[PDB]
Amino acid sequence: SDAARAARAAALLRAAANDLKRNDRAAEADLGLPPGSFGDYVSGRLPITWDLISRAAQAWPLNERDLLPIHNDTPQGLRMMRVKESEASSRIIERGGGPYYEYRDTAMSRQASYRPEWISMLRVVEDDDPDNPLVEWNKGHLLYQFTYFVGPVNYYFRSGGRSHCVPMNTGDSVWGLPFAPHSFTARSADEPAYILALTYGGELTGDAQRELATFGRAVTSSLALTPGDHGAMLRSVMAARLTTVTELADRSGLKTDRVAALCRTPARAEWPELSALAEALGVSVRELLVPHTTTEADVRIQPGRTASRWSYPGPDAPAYRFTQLAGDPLHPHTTSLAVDVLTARPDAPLPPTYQHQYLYVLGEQPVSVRWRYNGEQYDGRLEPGDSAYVIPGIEFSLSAEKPTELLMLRIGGSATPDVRFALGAMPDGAIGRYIAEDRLWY
Amino acid sequence: SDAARAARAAALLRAAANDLKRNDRAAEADLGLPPGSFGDYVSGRLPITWDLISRAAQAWPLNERDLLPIHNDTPQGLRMMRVKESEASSRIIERGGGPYYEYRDTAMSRQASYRPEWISMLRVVEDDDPDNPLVEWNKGHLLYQFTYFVGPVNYYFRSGGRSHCVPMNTGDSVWGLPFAPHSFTARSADEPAYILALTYGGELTGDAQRELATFGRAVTSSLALTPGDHGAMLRSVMAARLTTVTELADRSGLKTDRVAALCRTPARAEWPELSALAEALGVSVRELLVPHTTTEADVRIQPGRTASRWSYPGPDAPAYRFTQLAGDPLHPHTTSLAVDVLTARPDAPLPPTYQHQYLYVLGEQPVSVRWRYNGEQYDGRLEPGDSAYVIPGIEFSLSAEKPTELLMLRIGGSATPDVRFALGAMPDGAIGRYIAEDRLWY
Ligand SMILES: [Fe+3]
Ligand SMILES: [Fe+3]
Numbered sequence A, B: 001s002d003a004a005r006a007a008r009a010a011a012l013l014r015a016a017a018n019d020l021k022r023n024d025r026a027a028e029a030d031l032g033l034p035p036g037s038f039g040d041y042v043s044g045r046l047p048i049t050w051d052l053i054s055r056a057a058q059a060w061p062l063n064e065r066d067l068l069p070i071h072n073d074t075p076q077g078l079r080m081m082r083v084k085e086s087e088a089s090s091r092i093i094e095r096g097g098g099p100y101y102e103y104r105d106t107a108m109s110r111q112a113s114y115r116p117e118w119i120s121m122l123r124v125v126e127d128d129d130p131d132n133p134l135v136e137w138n139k140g141h142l143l144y145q146f147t148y149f150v151g152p153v154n155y156y157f158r159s160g161g162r163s164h165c166v167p168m169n170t171g172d173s174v175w176g177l178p179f180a181p182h183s184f185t186a187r188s189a190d191e192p193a194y195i196l197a198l199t200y201g202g203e204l205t206g207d208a209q210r211e212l213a214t215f216g217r218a219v220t221s222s223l224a225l226t227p228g229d230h231g232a233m234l235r236s237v238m239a240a241r242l243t244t245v246t247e248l249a250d251r252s253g254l255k256t257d258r259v260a261a262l263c264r265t266p267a268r269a270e271w272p273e274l275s276a277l278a279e280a281l282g283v284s285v286r287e288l289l290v291p292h293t294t295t296e297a298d299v300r301i302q303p304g305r306t307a308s309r310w311s312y313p314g315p316d317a318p319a320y321r322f323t324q325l326a327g328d329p330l331h332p333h334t335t336s337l338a339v340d341v342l343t344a345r346p347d348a349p350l351p352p353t354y355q356h357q358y359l360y361v362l363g364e365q366p367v368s369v370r371w372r373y374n375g376e377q378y379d380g381r382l383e384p385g386d387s388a389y390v391i392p393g394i395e396f397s398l399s400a401e402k403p404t405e406l407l408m409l410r411i412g413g414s415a416t417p418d419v420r421f422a423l424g425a426m427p428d429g430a431i432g433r434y435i436a437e438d439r440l441w442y
Helices: A002-019 A024-031 A038-043 A050-059 A083-088 A207-215 A217-223 A230-241 A245-252 A256-263 A271-280 A417-425 A430-435 B002-019 B024-031 B037-043 B050-059 B083-088 B207-215 B217-222 B230-241 B245-252 B256-262 B271-281 B417-425 B431-435
Strands: A078-081 A091-095 A098-105 A115-121 A144-150 A153-159 A162-167 A173-176 A182-186 A194-200 A299-302 A309-312 A320-324 A335-341 A356-361 A367-373 A376-382 A387-390 A395-399 A404-411 B078-081 B091-095 B098-105 B115-121 B145-150 B153-159 B162-167 B173-176 B182-186 B194-199 B299-302 B309-314 B317-324 B335-341 B356-361 B367-373 B376-382 B387-390 B395-399 B404-411
Touching: A002 A024, A002 A038, A002 B207, A024 A038, A024 A050, A078 A367, A078 A376, A083 A098, A115 A182, A115 A356, A144 A153, A144 A335, A153 A173, A153 A299, A194 A404, A207 A217, A207 B431, A217 B417, A217 B431, A230 A256, A245 A256, A245 A271, A256 A271, A335 A395, A356 A367, A376 A387, A430 B207, A430 B217, B002 B024, B002 B037, B024 B037, B024 B050, B078 B367, B078 B376, B083 B098, B115 B182, B115 B356, B145 B153, B145 B335, B153 B173, B153 B299, B194 B404, B207 B217, B230 B256, B230 B271, B245 B256, B245 B271, B256 B271, B335 B395, B356 B367, B376 B387
Parallel strands: none
Antiparallel strands: A078 A387, A091 A098, A098 A115, A115 A194, A144 A173, A144 A194, A153 A162, A153 A182, A173 A299, A309 A320, A320 A335, A335 A404, A356 A387, A356 A404, A367 A376, A367 A395, B078 B387, B091 B098, B098 B115, B115 B194, B145 B173, B145 B194, B153 B162, B153 B182, B173 B299, B309 B317, B317 B335, B335 B404, B356 B387, B356 B404, B367 B376, B367 B395
């Protein structure tokens, strides 16, 4: 595992040198390495130190970040975390003079952006007033949040200077935007009241944050695009091409008056207009479409009672019953589900998805999991309160001796649609070298 | 600025602790630190060391990479590189027992993915045969290639086991896919023959490579999507939502047989069908559409003589004359242009774009550049053969005392459209915190 990570780091060093058109001799000269030695660092015979990575960021126009791999802590492609481990991670935090939350980690991975916490509400309120002084608010946090409610939990949320309180119960859920302040209390001291607060990051975190942080606040603010504003998207692509209204009109076959009008409205153009504009701009129609959001006051609440329900693979012989939980079209790759596992057999493999997956066993019976990864088959059993992390691409099935429920949150990773289409365009054999460069570029 | 970068690293440390719901004392417990030291690290009283970052990656489900900022090496928003500096970076490479290429760096930044080399063709051929033994091929490299030709350069390229040669002349260009093998030679020893080989990264480099490398080649290949393949895109979203053909038909109003058939073809559904399917899947129609490509043999060649040209900002105000160079809809955010600078005054500012920009002066007269960044106005001059790098969001003008030509390559950075939608959805005032977290989460 450490040797595999070292190999990944060595491949990144060769890739960086190849990309800078530095062959072995040129890289040794730039990095102050002994003549003839570069192959020993690229092959793994010599370790790549933080000293060398720091020297490379000074000698070359790259960052220390560009030479570091990430860790693989999910070697079987799925990993379970046990209740005992979650309880050992316990943190109690006081707010307003008394204990307010108990936090427990659930299944996480260095390969994924999940930060999923079990959190019990320790503050009990006697009304649903958002301005109740017993409520201790947070400041909001960068990560998106999907929250699943168990018991009589009150959800408090703030946006544009107004505080709201929506009472929840078991099976309700909410999806929420970055930096939206919120809080949770219990309406009763008599029954369990807790949440699965499954926060996660996506594209905002990682490379985008590092880059935008160097540009500064003004440049970053100026790159923002408001959801649903198609005219702004069109203006942005026009600016990226350095085209003009009359030139785009001439190339697309649209009237100049129409192109100007489309630049000034959030409503999308008609489909034939979008196709003509896209071709004139050298982009797919995909790039002129802007997602809408369903959020209001920066959250989208899904009542469990009215949530969509369906059976898999179908009602004639159902293995699972799914309930659709809260999400948002700003994050089309986030799927949240309550899963009733009905089958006692391993006869219903779920289709592999490009998403990361997180599982948490809500029901009273254990769930047996069977999965495949890199030519091996594995099996395991999640007890109630156990959780699991699954990398993209894994085929697994679930079963239980009696019907039982689990919570499933699936999120997009860094392999976005654009990445996946780039992978699809690569010539045969190239994906291997993309994963781990193994040679000088000539 | 090392001090600013150290502050960025401190902020990432606070953010990582916030995301894991570790306050100061909890973080000190997890990391084995003495009491009070975690505040010292976040505040800057103690420097953040590789030892601390390594400890964090061992104790917490994060990567060392996640705690490192990138460098700001473009403090004025635009940075020029001079002929003398490019010449100083000269590297001569032999292939087949004699000189083949001279490489020279041009403007680059730790904030962008450009790897732009000036490259002189040192191998002279007497025919255009791709199997000529004087032609020495590379193995293909990870980065995308955008190449502008000067002089009688032969371009050689391989795809699918076949080798090709297209004789180029000044003003021709080509855009090429990752790992497509290629070469360049000169048809004459008696005139300059060289290229601007403006390689760059996109979606593939950085986070996505790091994650995919830990999943392995089998999973990574399974995630590929073929450009143009709408049925694969539909199947992907269906698998992400765990909707069968029958359930998606049920929701959308399309017949079961029609949904199944749309999953078996690259051709897109009809627009009303796409609208109904997207609504049923909780996504914008954008997520059922796919990029297409125009590449043949993995490249897209643009003859200079047939390239589209237009005046900017308009026909009746031609400050500049643009020539559209080689690109592809697989990279909608890549704009390649040859720019004839016609105005002698800085009276035609180019609108700010979300793209990074790279400039190289091709013509025989200097180009004056006036730009603004962070409330300050700057003036500079690019001599023939000088280059420049520009961060996103900069407004600049170009002027010259006589018409002169500049090569421009604009590429998308890590702030993808999805990042920009997310920035637009963020509550007002939170971009400061996104750039640099400055507080405990509660
Ligand atoms: Fe939260
Ligand atoms: Fe190349």
